[PDB]
Each structure stands twice: as C-alpha cells, then as structure tokens.
Design an enzyme around this catalytic site. Structure first.
Site, mmCIF file in Angstrom:
data_model
loop_
_atom_site.group_PDB
_atom_site.id
_atom_site.type_symbol
_atom_site.label_atom_id
_atom_site.label_comp_id
_atom_site.label_asym_id
_atom_site.label_seq_id
_atom_site.Cartn_x
_atom_site.Cartn_y
_atom_site.Cartn_z
ATOM 1 N N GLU A 55 0.617 -1.153 0.014
ATOM 2 C CA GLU A 55 -0.031 -0.113 -0.031
ATOM 3 C C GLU A 55 0.703 1.231 0.202
ATOM 4 O OE1 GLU A 55 -0.948 2.392 2.831
ATOM 5 O OE2 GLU A 55 -2.068 3.214 1.365
ATOM 6 N N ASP A 56 1.849 1.310 0.741
ATOM 7 C CA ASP A 56 3.033 2.314 0.801
ATOM 8 C C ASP A 56 4.070 2.157 0.104
ATOM 9 O OD1 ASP A 56 1.174 3.963 1.945
ATOM 10 O OD2 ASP A 56 2.199 4.544 3.769
ATOM 11 N N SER A 57 4.139 1.927 -1.299
ATOM 12 C CA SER A 57 5.234 1.477 -2.119
ATOM 13 C C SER A 57 5.034 2.014 -3.540
ATOM 14 C CB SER A 57 5.764 -0.046 -1.853
ATOM 15 O OG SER A 57 6.869 -0.133 -2.617
ATOM 16 N N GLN A 75 -0.613 9.240 -0.585
ATOM 17 C CA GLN A 75 0.291 9.177 0.487
ATOM 18 C C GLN A 75 1.647 8.677 -0.660
ATOM 19 O OE1 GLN A 75 -0.374 6.085 3.124
ATOM 20 N NE2 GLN A 75 1.459 6.539 4.226
#
Ligand code: ZN
Ligand code: ZN
Ligand code: ZN
Lengths: 427, 115, 117, 59, 65, 46, 44, 257, 117, 79
Positions: free
Chosen positions: C86-88, I1
């Site tokens: 998700e964070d990449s 993000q």
C-alpha cells in the site's frame, strides 16, 4: 538482529542497495545487534518473528487463485512449484487429465498447506440460505472452505479463511504444527501467489468506477426520493404538523428524522453499487476478499459520498442561520446542511466540497489527538504491569511479591495456545 | 556509494564458477543448475525447450532474488535419461533453432530490400 | 496555493487534499531562477521540471507552470512481482538512467575568521 | 521555505490561529464556514498543530 | 531545465524535436498538429514536447561571471 | 550498537524473519565473537 | 588567488590578508573562477 | 525431442523501424528475443566525459551526462571494438574506445546553442545520428564549453543510453484465440492492426488445443544501430551467450565425473 | 500518500504494452480504494487524452465541461480504450496478462525525503 | 526432592541454558556428546540438551525465597 516493550528478532541478509528490506506480511528504523552470545541465543529462541505471530497484495490474489475458474498449464505449474520450499519434489496428478493436463489453483495450494490440518471456513460472499439448502456440501458458488488431510478440497480463500482470526488456516497450523512450520506457510503463500500474479495480474481503473446506466438511474432516483422525503419532513415541521417523540424535542427530533432518510439512502444506494460490480470488476475483488478497502469506500466512489457530519451533527450555521452565504436563511435542506449527493467519480458541487472539507477536517483533528492519547495509555499500562510476572508456583506476582492472581488467567494457561470452541452440553 | 556496479549483472565474479550442478535427494533423477550472472532471458529459454522433450518429467527455473543476478534451474527426467543430459541436449536445440531463424532472416531480409 | 494545483479536488477526499498541501511543499523542484547566484543551506533543483499535462487555470497565476516541481510519468496501476505494498511503488531503472527523476543537491558552508580575542 | 516556489508562496500567505485564552477557548483547528473564499480549507499542516496554521485564499 | 535528449519511457530522441516544435507553434499550427509532423505517434514522447517548459531561457537573462 | 536510521522498503523474496541491510551500515556495526579452534581460520582471514 | 568581482565580472588578484574589494567597483563580494585540476565525469 | 524451425517473414522495412513476423516459435524464445534487443544488443555511447572549461548555466554533471544519451552511428565499428575490461589497456585506446571532442565558444549577442553537430569525433564513421539536431545546451554571450569525451561498447542492461531500441512493439495472438487475456467487455476493446477479424466479431473462437505462434515484431531504432541490423546482432548475440553456457556446463560435468 | 520506490526494474523487465510502452512507474492498485482518490484514474485518463490530442487538459475543480464520460469518449477516438485500460505483456514471461492494466501519464513529484541523506 | 515445580522445562529456561552452554562451548569448554563436525556452538549445545548431558543445574527461586535444584536432564524437554 533485533528491532521494533516487545521486540522481534531478525536474521540479517546483506543486499547491495542502501534502503533496508523487510518482508512485510516507509518509516525509518534502527536495528540493534546483540553483542553477547548468550542474549543472541536467547533472542533467536523466543524473540523471533515466527514466535511473535498477510499483505493486502497477496490476499486479493489468493482469492482469485483458489477460484474454481483458475486452471494452470504444465508450464505455469512448474514455475509456481519451484518457489515452493516445502515441496516433496513430486508433481501432483492433474485434476483434468484429458484432453490436456490442467492443475487447479487449489491443487497447487494443497502442497502449500503444511502437513495434515483440517478446518472448515466460509467465504465472505457465502449466502446464509446456501448452508441450509441441499447444496451445502456442494457449494453452488464455492463459498465454503473445507480442508482435509492438508488438501484444500473446496472453497475460495480470503481474509476470513487465510487471514488471522479465531479460526483460520494460519491459526490452525500454528497450534497443530508450530511457529517454524507456520512461517514457511506464510513464505510459500507470498512467493507462489506473487509468481502467479504475474500471469493473472491485478489492476484498477476507471472502468471499475463506471457502473451501468441502470444503476445510475436507481442511485439518482433514490437520491431524488430521499431529497423529496426530506422536503416533506421539513414541510411538516414548518407547518407544525410534525409531532416530537416523547423522548426528544422538536428540534432534535427533526434532525433525527432527516438523518435517517439521508443515512438510509447512502446504505441502500451503496448496497446496490456492491451488487452492480461484476466478478471481473477489480473493485469487487478487493472487498470480496476483504483485503483492502470497504463497501463504504466503493459507495462513496460510485453511488454517493453521504452526509458530512461535523461534531456528530450536520453542518452548523456558521453564518446567520445559513451554512453558507449562497443558501437562504434558516435553510435545512440536504444541500444546505452538507448532504453530499454526488459521488467522487461524478464530482462534488462547490458547496459540497467545502462541506466535505469540514467533515474531513474533524477526522484529521480527531486522528491527530487520537494517536497522542492512545499512545499515552499504552505507556501507562505497561509501567503499572511491567513487574507483573508468573512465578514458579503458578502464581502472578509483582516486584513486591504481592499475589495479583493465584493462577494466570484464573486457569493457568497461556493465551496463545487457547482456541475458540463451543461446548454443546448447555445449549 | 552503496549503488552496485551496473556491470555486475552480467560480469562474472572473480573466482566464482558460472555453472554449478547440484543433485537433489528429494526425488531420484533430479539436478539443480544454479547459473550465476544471468536473468530471465536465459531461464525461460531452456525451461520451455526442456518441456518439449518427452523424456523430461519436471523442468523449471526461478530467481531467489533479482539483485542476486543468479538463476536456479531444476530438471528431473526418467530413470533412463538424466537431468544433466536434458540440460546439454536442450541447449543444442536452441543453437540449431536460432541458427535456422538467423539464417532464414538473412534470406528474407534481402528479399524485402530488393522488393 | 497548494490546493489550487490539485485537479478534481472535489473528486478527491478531504484528508488527501490536506495531505497534498504538506507533500506539495516538501516536493523538490526549481524554486527560483537565480539559484546559482544565491547561497542556501538546503536547495533541491530538479533536472527536468516540466509543466504537467493536466493543469488548472489558477496554476497560471501561481506561476507553477513556469517553475514546476515534478516530472510526469506513464503510470500503470498493477501488482508486479508483489514488490509494492500500500505504501510503495515500483520504478523503471532504464527511465532513471535517462534522467527520469534525477535532481541536484546544494549545501552551503559558511565560515568567518574574526578577531574575537 | 525556498524548497519550492509553491511552498514560498504558501508561506508568505500563511496564517496563524490565535494563542492564549482566545485560541484555547475557541476551536481554531475546526474548519468554520467563514473560511469560504477567505482561507483555504484543504490546506493545513498535518500533526498536532493541525488547523492552527492555514493559508490565505488566492483571491 | 532543458529538454531531455530522449524519451524516458522508450528512448526516442526528443531534444532535437524541441527546436522544430517551437518553430511549428508560431507557424499557426495546432499544438497537437505539430507533434504529428515531428513523428511522435506514441503518447509518451508527445508528453515530453506538449507539456515541457524551457526554463533555460530565463536563466540566460542573468549575466555570467 | 545503534545504527543509522534508514527508510524501509518491502521485499517478498526475503523471509519474514530475515531482514535486508546495506553493506555500509553493516560495515560500521560490529559483533564481538570469541575465537575458537573450530573457527580460528575464519577469524584469521576476516 | 585570482577572483572575480560580483558586479563587473573582471579578474582581480587578491593576496592573503588583503582587503576584499574591487578596484573598478569597490564591490565587497568576490568569487573564484575555477580549479585547473579537472575531475572525471561518468554519464550515469 | 528437438526444437522447431522458426520461419520468419518481413512485413515492411524502413529506416526508423522494421516489422517482421516469426512463425513456429516457442513463446519463451520470442519473448526472450524481445528483451535481447533492449539489453543484450551492444552499442557505442559516450561514457567517459572530462570538461576543461565550463561556463554555461547548466552544471558540469548535467552537461557531461547529457552527452551519454546522444546515440552514435556505430553500425560495424561496435562489432570490431571490444569492452574496456577485456582489453589490455589501463587507459582508453582506439581499439577499446573512441575519441570525442566538443570545443565551442559563444561571443555573439544572440543566443547560441551547441548541438551534436559541433560534437567532433576522431572516427569518421562513429558520429552522432543527426550528424534536426540534438541540442546539448544553450550558451550565453561570453560562455564557453570545452570538454573531451570518450565512447565505449556496453550492454543495454548496463545503462539505458546503450539501448538502441526506441520501444519494441511485440505482439502475439492479436485476436485472443487462446484466451490468454480475458476482456470483461470484449466489444469495447479496439481491434489491433495485425488481427484478421470481422467488425461484428469481438474475438476469435477459443481453440481447445494450441500454442502461441506468429509473433509480430516492430523494432524501432534510435538511429545508432539500424533496425535491420539489430535483429542480426541480437540473434547472434543471444546464441553466442547460450553457447558460452554450454562451455562452462561441460566443465561442470567434467568435474562431477 | 508518498510511496517509496520498492524496486527498480530495467525496461525489459517492465510490463510492455502492444505498442511497446513500458510504464515508467507502477503503483499498488490497493492504494486507490482508501488512501488515494479516483482523481488519479481521472487524471490518468485526462493525461492520455491530453498527450494523444496534444492539448493541455483543464483541471478546474468545478467545471461542468470536463467529465469522466467526455474524457473517455475523446480517448476512444485515438484508438485507445475509453476507460484507459490496456493489455500489458509481462516482461519476464511474454504471455498476455489476464487483467488489462490501466496506464496513463500521471504527474508525479519527488519529495525531499531521500535515503541518501 | 519434594519438588513442586512442573516437570517440564520452560521455554525461557531452555533458551538460557542453551545460550549459556553455547557461550561456554565457545570458550574452550568440554563437550560431553560426540562431535560430528558441528562447528556452530549453538548446534553443539542443542544436541547436548537432546542427549541430556548439559551439566547446568537450574535453580528455580520460588517467590517465598525457597529454591529447587532441577537438572536439565531430569526436566522433560520438547523436541
Ligand atoms: Zn517515448
Ligand atoms: Zn568589479
Ligand atoms: Zn584498449
């Protein structure tokens, strides 16, 4: 090495590039190396990740992998089994021998399951009447998960079946086999599914957000009906026809009736959006597996964002009896009070954008203070129970040696090995 | 500083054997070919050809880590045949296969140039 | 200023718009034209800061078009090898070798020889 | 802040909520309706000081 | 600062096309029409020209040492 | 021996227990080890 | 060492322990032209 | 138990790109050859840059790097040249490198930009593709850019500048006969150029038995290596690497025995 | 993000489309639901139309002229999927990916947070 | 004798006993079991526990101040 009071140990592997690599299954970190051999031995024996215990990119593909539709050719099976560390070396017999071999996804996943563990789980999209129907054992939609002798005979896996819970494949394997075998189960699932994902592939696009024209009319019709109903409620209160409930006042009662009409519309339209999505649709795949997102998120993207409540209520009258200058004085309509009838895909009106910002601002403020307060509780609780420990007499005592509990948990059993079950001698 | 040299992907490390054949005891007639300094361009070339051979029971390749730049190939054959022979014979077919393609391409390239 | 540069903020979530306001400031790019003459402790300048393909009308008044702080990319939304959570995000090595997101870094060191004593 | 031109413009138009009794009694962090067309609603630093620091509207 | 030599995606040369791109714009040609003349069928290369700003022009205003 | 903090990236190839570390950071970090005849040569070469 | 005025951009030799000022301008800011020791650059 | 015969035909041949169709070939071989064009193909590009005087607005690192991205017309010189590592040199020689120079100075009031035409190379054949023109930098009055550069053979995987392929359009089974890709609404998707299908047919009927074949190739070159010669080098380059594996493989068997 | 570059892949390894356009960046699809916005997909659709038609798209938050359906119709005129989905061939294995990836020229910015520092 | 603690060996005791023994083995300590080429000290101690040869004696301090001497061999380990 050990890093983030419970810390998990890790085995360092040297890699060329600079950034740290972690098999999550972002934020900066510093890793501590135990110099002494004694603590190094202790860390590797009790503080390792297997004894401490899946990404959302694998759970979504796992649900697709175990689907009955998925069929694997000999060439594809060879790659998937190569990454399988816990492989006996013998290729399983194909489910469909003729006209051509075709291994089902479950057959490949059957080898992934370690040893012989039996459990029964249900898919998220499992109709309630299906179990009562004659096709309970032969699921029409493959919504029932059953494992026999370590083989996934039927059922599509998901967070409910594979994800951590009271009853799940990972949880059952941990109790049946242990932590070391369970870790290999995680690694095999991650590696094998990733290789298969290169063939099937997971994506997302505008087509997922774009629904059929039939549902758009229904969503607008429901929105229109809700808007008309709100006006009718306002008219009743305007003419004093509305009667307050005995347990509430007129002003609060009116706010309650209008909220339900708007709240019901979002849920009804949102529920229709969930049914609107086809199986091929990527939005449905995420929620069906339960990996990432939620049915409400799809509702705000397709059907309607919903009411933007501030401080637990609708948008207040910041100006003189009007939420914004554009709206007339003493306006209690949907648009005036912050009801957002436009989905994210369609686009919000200028009035709705500010109202949406007001609602989002409250969440950010609550989130900012929530972390600060919640973090304070964690530190406080640890200090008051840091010295609490189980002694050799099966008693819980603190540093002062005062008996907090005669037996840990009043039974004298660990909280990790216990499993949920329902004895049938009282119901 | 920490960026690996760009040529290490294909350059052979000093004092490092390019090919290593390791027998597998899990199943008889199985060998592992841990090739070094190669990518999927070579792994899929031999795997597909090995499958075409009827005497091959199980053939495949995988990369333990992309940054490692080493590929592992596992080949299993019938008791009469050997995985080592499968790897050798398959390569010869590829050389012949590309020779016909290269030769035929040179035959057709001139045909288009003249008309 | 930071919210204006966002297309379809109405289509976007309020926290995301607020989150961008912080990220937009942290974005590196050409901040002014006379960067060579001045001396700054921290100054990140992008190799190829190009105007975006999707720009807002208010962007003209901010002059962000003249001095953008990013490079457009052909982004394919897919799960490739499972190396992106998700964070990449996954990049293209060949693109970077051609100047995809490369930027310079300036650090100014100051010192004076004074007769304090 | 000279990291980016947009950041420089935002900093010059930056606003600060009142401190002391006035700010303490009121809810400066919460977004009010009066900000429409005067103070940007979306723009606000993230963290403990969320909503205290804002930016002037373009017009 | 200056137009990149080649497309970051595929590698097609785009620096040489910048000089002709500006020349075509002042020749009453449309923004998209100029790209077709230069021979940019892919949208990746058309991006490098359609949405590129040449900052070096303003930097050259300052006198050198 | 606290190390210099660095960003975190995912790596499904690595096992969940395993952690990737750069050469530079590991170079600064040291692990005292008692030499023994069974590994006297290993310390002699290092 | 040889320096360059920040206003006229002309060479002016300034020795050690010498006031920093341009004769043609009086400007108090001076720069350094370049070093004769060249470095190696790799297109990466 | 042997390989097939990869029959190949050419559709259209032009300076920028060449289109050819390969039949009776395995999917792995066709897919591998596609990436062989990008990485395995060696071309000559500037890699060593040294500046003697740089007064331009852009920095030395930016200016020096930009030269590498400029392709060089190394058609047959690349083949005869050898990598710096395997040569017997500690410094670049004509036999393992080539000399490049660029000495320009702007004195006119009007803005003058140095392009690849001013990039002088000792080897007459090894020259920039444009030699409109690849502009390197824009120079102001009183600004000079004198530097010396060298170019060496290198693999495409080593750096993107050594990639002669300006986008490889590799396609197979355009009509989706084998259902390797499933479309939720096949009607909406457009028809590919190579597909042979009617307007009213969304996709060809599924064939229970079949294999990928008739791969369509469109190799687009950046001008360094001609698209009609890259394929010849790629096929020879891929197989010469394959043979090298066999040579080392034989040694391993010699050790086991 | 903000998303860290999980891995860098060479042009060969990246998933190329029919026309041979390897995406410069690949992002995780699981971000779109919650910590992202549909504007990313809309911006990708607008970017594809803008690049194909050679016109800078309008990013006015409240302009009724710009719509998702209108952008989709414009894209279909240039031989592209109305929703922007494309068939991406996996770099490692040449077989077509079952799912059709959504690829578009999305604007991206590099944040000051860098591992080197 | 008259020992009331559990016959089994806790995980914490197992980790410390092996860790302390492994440290001792690395310090030129004698090994009771036969050595078959196991270089790593932890493996040497691990098999020692399996064969019930570790001389270490565990002294479990009860909360009341009393102590019980439990031998590693006497305790029932889990393999
Ligand atoms: Zn391009
Ligand atoms: Zn002067
Ligand atoms: Zn030489």
């Amino acid at each position: 090495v050990i890093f983030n009071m419970s810390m998990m140990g890790h085995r360092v592997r040297i890699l060329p590039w600079s950034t740290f690599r972690l098999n999550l299954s972002g934020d900066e970190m510093n890793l501590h190396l135990p110099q002494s051999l004694e603590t190094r031995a202790e860390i590797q024996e009790l503080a390792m990740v297997p004894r401490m215990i899946i990404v959302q990119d694998t759970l979504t593909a796992v649900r697709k992998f175990t689907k009955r539709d998925v069929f694997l050719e000999r060439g594809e099976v060879m790659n998937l089994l190569m990454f399988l560390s816990t492989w006996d070396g013998k290729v399983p017999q194909p489910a469909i021998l003729k006209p051509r071999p075709l291994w089902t996804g479950k057959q490949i996943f059957s080898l992934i399951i370690p040893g012989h563990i039996n459990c029964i789980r249900t898919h998220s999209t499992h109709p309630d009447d299906e179990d009562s129907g004659p096709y309970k054992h032969i699921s029409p939609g493959d919504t029932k998960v059953v494992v026999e002798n370590g083989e996934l005979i039927m059922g599509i896996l998901c967070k409910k079946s594979l994800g951590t819970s009271a009853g799940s494949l990972v949880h059952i394997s941990y109790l049946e086999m242990g932590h070391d075998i369970t870790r290999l189960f995680y690694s095999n699932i991650q590696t094998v599914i990733n290789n298969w994902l290169l063939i099937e592939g997971h994506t997302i696009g505008i087509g997922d957000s774009i629904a059929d024209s039939k549902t758009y009319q229904d969503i607008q019709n429901t929105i229109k009906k809700a808007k008309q109903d709100v006006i009718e409620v306002i008219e009743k209160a305007h003419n004093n026809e509305l009667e307050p409930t005995p347990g509430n006042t007129l002003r609060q009662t009116f706010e309650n009736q209008v909220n339900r009409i708007l709240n019901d519309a979002r849920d009804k339209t949102g529920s229709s959006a969930q049914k609107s999505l086809s199986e091929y649709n990527n939005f449905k795949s995420m929620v069906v597996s339960g990996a990432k997102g939620s049915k409400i998120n799809i509702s705000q993207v397709i059907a309607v964002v919903g009411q933007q409540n501030v401080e637990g209520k609708r948008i207040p009258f910041g100006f003189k009896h009007r939420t914004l200058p554009h709206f007339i004085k003493d306006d209690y309509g949907p648009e005036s009070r912050g009801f957002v009838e436009n989905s994210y895909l369609a686009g919000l009106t200028p009035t709705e954008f500010f109202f949406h910002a007001m609602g989002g601002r409250e969440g950010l403020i609550d989130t900012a203070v929530k972390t600060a307060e919640t973090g304070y509780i964690q530190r406080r609780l640890i200090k008051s129970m840091e010295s609490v420990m189980v002694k050799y007499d099966a008693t819980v005592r603190n540093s002062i040696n005062q008996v907090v509990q005669l037996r840990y948990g009043e039974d004298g059993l660990a909280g990790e090995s216990v499993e949920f079950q329902n004895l049938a001698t009282l119901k | 500083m920490n960026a690996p040299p760009a040529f290490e992907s294909f350059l052979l490390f000093e004092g490092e054997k390019k090919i290593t054949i390791n027998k597998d005891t899990k199943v008889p007639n199985a060998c592992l070919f841990t090739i070094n300094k190669e990518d999927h361009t070579l792994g899929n070339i031999i795997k597909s050809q090995l499958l075409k051979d009827p005497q091959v029971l199980f053939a495949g390749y995988k990369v333990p880590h992309p940054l490692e730049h080493k590929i592992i190939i596992r080949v299993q054959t019938t008791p009469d045949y050997s995985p080592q022979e499968a790897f050798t014979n398959a390569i010869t077919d590829l050389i012949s296969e590309l020779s016909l393609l290269e030769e035929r391409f040179r035959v057709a390239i001139k045909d288009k140039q003249e008309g | 200023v930071c919210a204006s540069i966002i297309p379809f903020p109405d289509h976007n979530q309020s926290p995301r718009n607020t989150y961008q306001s912080a990220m937009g400031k942290q974005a590196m790019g050409v901040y002014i034209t006379n960067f060579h003459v001045r001396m700054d402790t921290l100054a990140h300048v992008l190799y190829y800061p190009q105007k975006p393909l999707v720009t807002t009308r208010s962007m003209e008044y901010l002059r962000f078009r003249e001095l953008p702080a990013g490079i457009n990319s052909i982004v394919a939304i897919a799960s490739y090898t499972g190396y992106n959570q998700e964070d990449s995000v996954i990049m293209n090595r060949s693109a970077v070798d051609r100047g995809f997101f490369r930027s310079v870094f300036y650090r100014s060191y100051k010192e004076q020889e004074s007769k304090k004593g | 802040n000279r990291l980016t031109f947009a950041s420089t413009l935002s900093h010059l138009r930056r606003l600060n909520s009142p401190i002391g009794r006035d700010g303490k009694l009121a809810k400066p962090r919460q977004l009010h309706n009066t900000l429409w067309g005067m103070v940007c609603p979306a723009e606000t630093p993230e963290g403990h000081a969320v909503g205290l620091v804002k930016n002037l509207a373009l017009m | 600062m200056i137009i990149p030599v080649r497309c970051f995606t595929c590698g097609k040369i785009v620096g040489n096309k910048w000089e002709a791109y500006l020349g075509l714009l002042q020749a009453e040609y449309t923004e998209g029409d100029a790209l077709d003349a230069l021979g940019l069928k892919r949208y990746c290369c058309r991006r490098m020209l359609l949405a590129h700003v040449d900052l070096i022009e303003k930097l050259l205003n300052y006198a050198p040492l | 021996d606290f190390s210099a903090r660095t960003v975190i990236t995912p790596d499904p190839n690595l096992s969940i227990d395993q952690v990737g570390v750069p050469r530079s950071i590991a170079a600064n970090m040291t692990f005292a080890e008692i030499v023994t005849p069974f590994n006297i040569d290993r310390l002699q070469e290092l | 060492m040889i320096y360059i005025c920040g206003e006229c951009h002309t060479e002016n030799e300034i020795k050690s322990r010498d006031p920093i000022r341009c004769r043609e301008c009086g400007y108090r800011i001076m720069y350094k032209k370049r070093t004769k020791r060249l470095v190696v650059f790799d297109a990466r | 138990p042997y390989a097939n015969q990869p029959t190949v035909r050419i559709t259209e041949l032009t300076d920028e790109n060449v289109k050819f169709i390969i039949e009776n070939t395995d999917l792995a071989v066709a897919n591998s050859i596609r990436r062989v064009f990008i990485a395995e193909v060696p071309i000559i590009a500037i890699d060593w840059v040294q500046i003697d005087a740089n007064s331009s607005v852009l920095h030395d690192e930016f200016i020096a790097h930009r030269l590498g991205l400029i392709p060089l017309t190394s058609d047959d010189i690349v083949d005869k040249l050898q990598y710096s590592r395997d040569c017997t040199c500690e410094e670049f020689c004509p036999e393992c490198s080539v000399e490049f120079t660029l000495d320009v100075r702007c004195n006119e009031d009007q803005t003058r930009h140095v392009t690849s035409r001013d990039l002088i190379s000792n080897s007459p054949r090894v020259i920039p593709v444009t030699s409109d023109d690849i502009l390197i930098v824009k120079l102001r009055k009183g600004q000079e850019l004198r530097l010396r550069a060298y170019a060496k053979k290198g693999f495409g995987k080593e750096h993107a500048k050594w990639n002669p392929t300006a986008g490889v359009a590799f396609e197979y089974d355009p009509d989706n006969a084998l259902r390797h890709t499933v479309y939720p609404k096949p009607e909406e998707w457009p028809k590919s150029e190579y597909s042979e299908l009617d307007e009213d047919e969304s996709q060809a009927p599924y064939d229970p038995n079949g294999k990928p074949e008739r791969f369509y190739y469109n190799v687009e070159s950046c001008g360094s290596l001609r698209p009609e010669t890259i394929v010849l080098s790629a096929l020879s380059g891929l197989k010469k690497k394959l043979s090298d594996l066999q040579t080392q493989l034989s040694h391993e068997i010699q050790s086991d025995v | 993000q903000k998303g860290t570059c999980g891995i860098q892949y060479r042009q060969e390894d990246m998933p190329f489309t029919c026309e041979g356009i390897t995406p410069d960046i690949i992002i995780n699809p699981h971000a779109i639901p919650s910590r992202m916005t549909i504007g990313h997909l809309i911006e990708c659709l607008q970017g594809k139309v803008s690049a194909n038609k050679g016109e800078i798209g309008d990013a006015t938050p409240f302009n009724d002229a710009v719509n998702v359906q209108k952008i989709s119709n414009l894209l279909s005129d240039y031989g592209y999927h109305l929703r922007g989905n494309e068939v991406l061939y996996n770099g490692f294995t040449g077989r077509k990916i079952t799912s059709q990836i959504f690829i578009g020229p999305t604007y991206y910015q590099r944040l000051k947070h860098m591992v080197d520092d | 004798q008259k020992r009331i603690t559990t016959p089994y060996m806790t995980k914490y005791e197992r980790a410390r006993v092996l860790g302390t023994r492994a440290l001792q083995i690395a310090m030129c300590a004698p090994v009771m079991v036969e050595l078959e080429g196991e270089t790593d000290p932890l493996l040497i101690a691990m098999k020692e526990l399996k064969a019930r040869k570790i001389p270490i004696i565990i002294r479990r301090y009860l909360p009341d101040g009393s102590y019980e001497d439990w031998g590693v061999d006497e305790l029932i380990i889990s393999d």
